[PDB]
Design a protein around this ligand. Structure first.
Ligand SMILES: [Mg+2]
Ligand SMILES: [Mg+2]
Ligand SMILES: [Mg+2]
Ligand SMILES: [Zn+2]
Lengths: 500, 500, 64
RNA sequence: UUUACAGUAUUUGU
């Protein structure tokens, strides 16, 4: 019967394992957010570079940047600063080879490079400076502050935003921040004026600093840390981050029972990695990701039908909202709630979902339930998903989740063999295939194979079982007249390795 | 530049392989429909049985039937015949153990049994008899026939439908059909009156008979068959099916180059089995199936952007329409066309799709492109999809298409080991895991494992690499005090086999 | 062999590492060998990599 | 992590 407010919200930092630093927001024992960092795979979003313009595109109204990755970043027209420009075409604003101050809006995904803007933003605890453009500024829509904002001394060419954490802080306190921002900016444009033009300038902070900078509302009761050395670092991060009011709140955890286990969130953390997640009342949601989009289905538990569909869909809306966050799912998401005949049920389920994602930091947009029962929504990509970052594509099935049955596949291969055997100038065709495929072709289909060889007089069909493949994989190589060897059937895979 | 009408439409029947009988409708060399049948996995839709009512459900307004499968069929209220009933509740109409004449509307899918109706329908070449209800009848919406329908002599309690193939046939010709139907019906209700009440009554015809009964429009030029014995059978099927006008059209194929290869449809047939399908101009569609639904994405080729998105989306609409048919995709389908800024583009793409599925036999419903760029549609399930029928769930990934990385997984297991080790009365915990998982835990994580054993004084953590697993799979078994053996670590998997 | 060394003999392996302060003993199970075969390679100071234990056989293939 | 003067309610009537 979760109600926000009942239990303490806490920040649990588990840092006993070098290879995975974990930060969890927990409410009582209810995990509602997670962040995991490991050496090497450190974050690149909100780094700043000195990049040189590679190639221009009026076609796309943007241009490409060598910021120093093996792959170049993508820089849209709407993102180039009036100050960098000696509605127009991009062919008009920037030159090829031209240096420029660049920030990463979005990490590389799939094939794309990274979206960049020249409109750099510098986040502090209470403020975000946009030294590069005045057009921007204001109050966290989550909120005297109008009154205190006006009083800071911001340089003409720039605007700024008061953060959600500003709520409880005063003017002079914002200025302390506003400045550290300006310092940094000065250092930035200077560490750039003094070089050539492809290098990193500012590395975004690690997962604890980020947590502290971005996740510490007032309603965070305690920050538990399970490792002394790290804890000490944390204290310095808080102070340095201008948040004395949290010092008392940081506490070393010392139980023998590991932190995350003591607060019982380990199974909830694991739920992020599962395809199916049980709901409180017995049903579940099933999350599938596809090329286009993430699809989520909903099943009920095992009694009013109408009431069951409703209560289950409501539970699902809650669970989806957190799975979205834990899994860092982004982009298009399509939800298949159980059918409800009463329209008012449909609105209530939508509203439940709207409510449930209100605390999410990612921008989100939801629509209504379609006449087919689908709800479409979009969530902003804050960082790569669990799938991209802790998984890899199945090596068996190639992401497809299924495997063609042996006979189906065998007959496919058989037809492919015959086609090859028909081509002019063919001397042999070698089919290299999984063991059971070989079995089936050379027993169940021995006649066919025989017929092929007899119709195509003089053509050898060699079909070799290869224990180094499993089914779906195979090769059918064609051997032209004159280029055959006296190689043994079963030493044949190895021969073709230098393909295959 | 395909235009319907240019080339001959043909029916190609490939029957040289005992284990897969294939029927293709081809237009010129363009495959537009496929059907594949193999011994054993014969069709069950439109079989008729004598079933006994198992259990009733006012909750669902329907009841269950033992028609003789291991699993019982599902029989909705709207489907029970006024004649079988000695708006009400189902608790009111049928008794438990009560015999009844039952037809299969839909094959078993997943967990469901099969949807059944008592409103039996008997399809002939030109007519469909619904002996069980008059409320039904008319003209193929694809079409003197009003005038000739009236003239048949149909028994009062029953209605009938004139098929699309009726177009070119006369009255007396419908009667010839109308009767063979009535004969059959008589035989049906008689082979039922004379037994007890769980048995098969009528087995639906095989894939060639069905093809002939259901797919032979006038615009079918030739029926090629590549096997003499089968061809002879076909002749009898046509005659028996009352279609002399097709006799001249059936022709033995005799090339050495196999039929489907001569007409170049083998690669198109194969496209049905691929996740990605190239479009004429270079782009492609990618088809993913999920618990909820089938998702299709669309990519473009490598020049007006607006024009490219449009032309590609149009090509896709065509290809999707046929993939839907070839793959026998049914249920909810969601299509992610490339973004188009001009709304008129959006309508044109929708309309293209509507047009492209007009020839499909399955009922279909399309909606508009959403504000998120998605198009939702539904297609009636005519029979199981390629996925259900020629594939099986990946054995590696369990349908998920991905595999958790080794370190991620290892740390998961490590935490699970420690939890087990903490429980009262624990003597040892055995973790049985893939080779590389073992490597990582027992090297990279050897300290952790060590610490666990030292904190939990007296608890053995045995972590054994097992070459019979690959990663995601593993077992963590807990061993209580007193129940440990002196078994060797590596003979341990085998011990637990009688689990595990 | 890996199983036995890293379970039945885990203490010994541990002791070795503790007596020889600073020396890593990496023992990796390799499904491409069966028993009698094995390799024990020594890695000098300065020439170690940050290679994962189980990607280690493959590294040493260009021996081994 | 985003843009003002405004708009009213409480109050006001021996
Ligand atoms: Mg797309
Ligand atoms: Mg559903
Ligand atoms: Mg999948
Ligand atoms: Zn797989």
């Amino acid at each position: 019967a979760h109600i926000e407010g009942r239990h303490m919200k806490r920040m649990l930092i588990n840092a006993t394992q070098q290879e995975e630093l974990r930060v969890a927001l927990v409410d009582g024992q209810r995990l509602y957010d997670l962040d995991i960092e490991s050496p090497g795979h450190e974050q690149k979003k909100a780094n700043i570079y000195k990049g040189k313009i590679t190639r221009i595109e009026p076609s796309l109204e943007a241009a490409f940047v060598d910021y120093g990755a093996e792959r170049h970043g993508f820089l849209p027209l709407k993102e180039i600063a009036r100050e960098y420009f000696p509605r127009p075409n991009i062919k008009d604003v920037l030159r090829e080879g031209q240096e420029v101050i660049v920030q990463i809006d979005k990490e590389e995904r799939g094939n794309k490079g990274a979206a960049l803007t020249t409109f750099i933003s510098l986040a502090g605890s209470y403020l975000v400076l946009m030294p590069n453009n005045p057009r921007a500024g204001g109050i966290s829509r989550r909120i005297e502050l109008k009154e205190a904002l006006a009083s800071l001394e911001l340089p003409e060419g720039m605007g700024l935003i008061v953060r959600t954490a500003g709520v409880g802080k005063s003017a002079e306190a914002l200025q302390w921040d506003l400045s550290f921002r300006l310092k940094h900016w000065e250092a930035i444009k200077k560490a750039a004026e003094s070089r050539p033009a492809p290098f990193l300038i500012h590395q975004e902070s690690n997962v604890i600093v980020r947590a502290f900078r971005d996740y510490l509302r007032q309603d965070i009761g305690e920050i538990l840390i399970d490792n002394p050395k790290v804890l000490e670092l944390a204290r310095q991060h808080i102070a340095a981050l201008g948040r004395p009011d949290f010092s008392s709140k940081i506490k070393l955890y010392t139980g023998e029972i590991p932190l995350f286990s003591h607060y019982q969130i380990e199974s909830q953390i694991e739920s992020a990695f599962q395809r199916e997640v049980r709901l409180p009342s017995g049903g579940s949601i099933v999350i599938d990701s596809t090329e286009a989009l993430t699809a989520i289905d909903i099943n009920s538990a095992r009694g009013d039908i109408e009431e069951t569909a409703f209560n289950t869909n409501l539970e699902a809306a809650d669970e989806i909202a957190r799975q979205l966050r834990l899994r860092d799912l982004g982009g298009l998401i399509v939800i298949d709630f159980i059918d409800m005949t009463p329209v008012r049920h449909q609105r209530a389920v939508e509203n439940r979902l709207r409510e449930a994602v209100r605390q999410d930091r990612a921008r989100i947009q939801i629509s209504h339930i379609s006449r087919f029962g689908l709800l479409e929504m979009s969530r902003q990509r804050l960082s790569p998903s669990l799938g991209e970052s802790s998984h890899h594509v199945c090596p068996r099935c190639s992401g497809t989740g299924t495997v063609r049955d042996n006979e189906s596949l065998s007959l496919s291969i058989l037809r492919l063999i015959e086609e090859e055997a028909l081509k002019e100038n063919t001397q042999e065709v070698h089919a290299i295939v999984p063991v059971p495929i070989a079995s089936y072709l050379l027993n169940e289909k021995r006649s066919a194979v025989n017929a092929i060889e007899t119709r195509q007089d003089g053509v050898r069909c060699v079909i070799v079982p290869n224990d180094q493949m499993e089914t779906p994989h195979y090769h059918v190589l064609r051997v032209r007249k004159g280029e055959e060897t006296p190689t043994l059937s079963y030493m044949l895979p190895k021969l073709h390795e230098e393909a295959m």
